[PDB]
Every structure is written in structure tokens, then in C-alpha cells.
Amino acid sequence: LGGLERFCSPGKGRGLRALQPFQVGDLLFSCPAYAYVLTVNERGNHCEYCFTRKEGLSKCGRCKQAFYCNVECQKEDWPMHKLECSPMVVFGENWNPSETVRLTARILAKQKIHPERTPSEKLLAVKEFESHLDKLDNEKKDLIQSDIAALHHFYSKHLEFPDNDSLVVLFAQVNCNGFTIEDEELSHLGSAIFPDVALMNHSCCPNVIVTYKGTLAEVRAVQEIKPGEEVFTSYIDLLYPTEDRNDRLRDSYFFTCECQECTTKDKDKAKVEIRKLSDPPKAEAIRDMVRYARNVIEEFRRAKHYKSPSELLEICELSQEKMSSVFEDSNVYMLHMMYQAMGVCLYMQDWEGALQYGQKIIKPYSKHYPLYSLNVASMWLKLGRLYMGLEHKAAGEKALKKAIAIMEVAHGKDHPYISEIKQEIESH
Ligand SMILES: C[S@@+](CC[C@H](N)C(=O)[O-])C[C@H]1O[C@@H](n2cnc3c(N)ncnc32)[C@H](O)[C@@H]1O
Ligand SMILES: [Zn+2]
Ligand SMILES: [Zn+2]
Ligand SMILES: [Zn+2]
């Protein structure tokens, strides 16, 4: 694809570089999804085939668990829908495959249907994906085996499975190159595989941002890219300090980042901000809170699957109180709990609580992320839609206009999401 090229990136394997300049907001390229799945919770909200968010969604009369825009989207999805239609109804409540198993089954399907290079593989092919097979611990290798067992159990009707456990190779490849599709509010819509998009290496200070216009991945410049510069995306959440960022990257992607931010650690001091207070906190007292903060984060990750919403908020308020003694309110570990608490109030349809948390987050949040960040665009959007809901038309408009500003860069001026937000301002 024009104005870019695949190249050998010293110490980063294969990569994508520019052959022409790209300005802030310019679309480098699009990539139609090679394989994709609409997440189970978004059924009836989005079209299974084109991911269009609409209300007049017609049901699959054969499974009553697949929705479409019309009969053509339904017919166009049947080669992929075939995999789950009858099994969902025949397996009944016993039908529980994870999204990774759902996705991998559609990759195997695509490889049988269309074995030749797809328009999504102009620079990187699915077969050429990096696996990191050789660095997997037994715990990880066992987690892939669960997924393989699950593949065989639910998708054996139409699929012929490959040469021993070269399914381990494929499952390690989808873990390494697999994409999750999120909406305007960064809510999970599904999983997909974008091969050319997967060629891009990581930077904690990227020059590009991946957005989705249905099942189509779009790459837009968030910094100026000049000929010969490598195009880098972020694989992870850029709020956390160097250690946390690299702890996630090493775990999920088996590499350590050495970008300007991870080298310099410049933004680290501000990220884990400490209170100025009479008799400043001791060097060890700081390290003790970081360990607590990082453990309460994981404890919360578990607690959501098995605790009441009023219990979840209690975890948030209690942990914020312990942390507040050492940590300032701008600290990323404090801002996470506030983000968690806002999420709960939103679930409980507590629009005041959600707004009080948003307002408390946004200013310090904006500061901690790059200039064009999907996290802060989404946060400004949540805040705007909350204000607008609570009939605060002035503040709601400021917030929605702030979101539109970041969004016109990453998503593009003509994005369906921008047109939706503009209508929210125009009516109320
Ligand atoms: C989605 S693939 C990117 C394309 C990959 N470089 C290739 O040749 O197939 C992700 C993998 O690329 C490598 N990678 C990406 N960004 C990197 C970086 N900044 N430093 C080192 N390795 C990186 C890691 O091995 C990582 O798991
Ligand atoms: Zn459709
Ligand atoms: Zn069906
Ligand atoms: Zn980095």
C-alpha cells in the first residue's frame, strides 16, 4: 500500500516505514478485517456482519442469537456464521467458547475459503505472524491447550484441524497480533485480525492511532511522520509509569520498549505524584504504596466478577483513602480507582456519581496521556453525555466539542461517531 513500506527494524523484527510525509490527522492506510467476531454482549446492538450500530436489527431465525441490518448482511455473514448458528442451539447453555477460540475458528475458516493473499495482507500475511512460541512458560502453554481443547469441542463440524499442535503456533500468533475493536466510549465490541496493521511496532510515544469504521481498521497520524521514519502505534494504555508499561509489554508481547519515554522516564515523576506535606514521605513509604496500589488494582480486577456494585465502590473509596495519605489526587494509581468507581456508577445508572468522578479525573487525565489520546477523547465524551443527560447544556457542549477535537484527528472529520456527537449538541 502506497507511501509506506515493510522493512527490517533493527531489534524490532519487521516494521512499517514512510516513503512520503504524513501530517497530523492524515490517513496512512485502511485495512479491512481478515477475520472478526462481534462480542457476545453486543448482540442485538450491532450488525454481526458490518458492525453497524442500529435499532431495526433482524434476528437469525435459526439461532435467535445473531442480528443483521438486512438479509444481505445476513447472507454475507453466513460463511462465518455457519460455525456457531446450529452449535449455539444444539449445545444450548453448554455453548461457552472464549472470544479467542471464536476468532481462531474464523481464521481457520477464512484459510479454507480464501487460501490466497487477502486485500488485508498487502504487507504482512497471517501465516508470517510472530508467535513467540519458544518463550512461553508452562502456565501459558497450558492456557493455549485449554483454548485448543475448546476449539475441537465447539468447532469440529466444518473445520479440518492442522498438523499436530501447530494450533499452539496459531493461538500464540492471534495473542501477539490480535486486535480488539472498541467504540467511541472505548467499550468492547469484538475481536479481529488486521494483518497489515499488525506490522506496526510499538512506541509509548506513537506517531499513529488505530480506529475502526465498522470492521475496517484506520491508521491516522497523531504526530508528523517524515520519509524514512518508522510508523509506530501503542499496544498498551499510556497512563502508567515505565515499569508498569514494560511489565504489561513483556507479559503480553514478550519485549521491552526502549522508546524516548521508556529511556528518558521523564513523565514518571508526575505519574506517581507524591503529596508535598510537612515532613515529606520516606523513599520506602513511596515504594510500599506502589506495591499496595498495584495489588488493589488486581484485587479489583478479580472482585468485579464476584462482588456487588456497592461493594466495588467501597473497594474504590477505601483504597483511595489509604493512598491519599502519600499520593496526590493527580497520581495515576488514584486516577485508576476513580476511573473504576466512575465505571460502577455508570453501570448502576448513577449519573451524578459518574459525573462527580469524571470531573475529578479529566484535567489530570488529559495531562498524563499524549496530545491525541482515545482515552481522554472517550472521557470528555462520557462527561459531555453525562452533563447533557443531567441537563447541563453549556458544560456538556464544551466537553463534547473537546472530544470532537481529538476525534477529528484519530477518527477523521467525516467519521460516523463525529456526526452522531454533532447531533447530540444540535438537538439538546
Ligand atoms: C504485532 S507484531 C509487530 C510486527 C513484528 N515486529 C513482526 O516482525 O512480525 C508485535 C511483536 O513485534 C515486536 N515488537 C513490536 N514493537 C517492538 C518494540 N518497540 N521493540 C521490540 N520489539 C517490538 C515484539 O516481538 C512484539 O511481540
Ligand atoms: Zn449490517
Ligand atoms: Zn444463526
Ligand atoms: Zn516505550
UniProtKB/Swiss-Prot annotation:
One of its GO terms (biological process) is heart development. Residues 2-236 form the SET domain. Induction: Expression is repressed by CEBPA. It is an enzyme of class 2 (transferase). Its EC number is 2.1.1.-, 2.1.1.354. InterPro entries: H3K4_H4K5_MeTrfase, SET_dom, SET_dom_sf, SMYD2_SET, TPR-like_helical_dom_sf, Znf_MYND. Zn(2+) 1 binds at residues 47, 50, 69, 73. The modification Phosphoserine is found at residue 278. Keywords: Chromatin regulator, Cytoplasm, Metal-binding, Methyltransferase, Nucleus, Phosphoprotein, S-adenosyl-L-methionine, Transcription, Transcription regulation, Transferase, Zinc, Zinc-finger. Changing residue 426 to K: Strongly reduces methyltransferase activity on p53/TP53. It catalyses: L-lysyl(4)-[histone H3] + 3 S-adenosyl-L-methionine = N(6),N(6),N(6)-trimethyl-L-lysyl(4)-[histone H3] + 3 S-adenosyl-L-homocysteine + 3 H(+); L-lysyl-[protein] + S-adenosyl-L-methionine = N(6)-methyl-L-lysyl-[protein] + S-adenosyl-L-homocysteine + H(+). Belongs to the class V-like SAM-binding methyltransferase superfamily. Interacts with RNA polymerase II and HELZ. Interacts with SIN3A and HDAC1. Interacts (via MYND-type zinc finger) with EPB41L3. Interacts (via SET domain) with p53/TP53. Interacts with RB1 and HSP90AA1. This is N-lysine methyltransferase SMYD2. The gene is SMYD2.
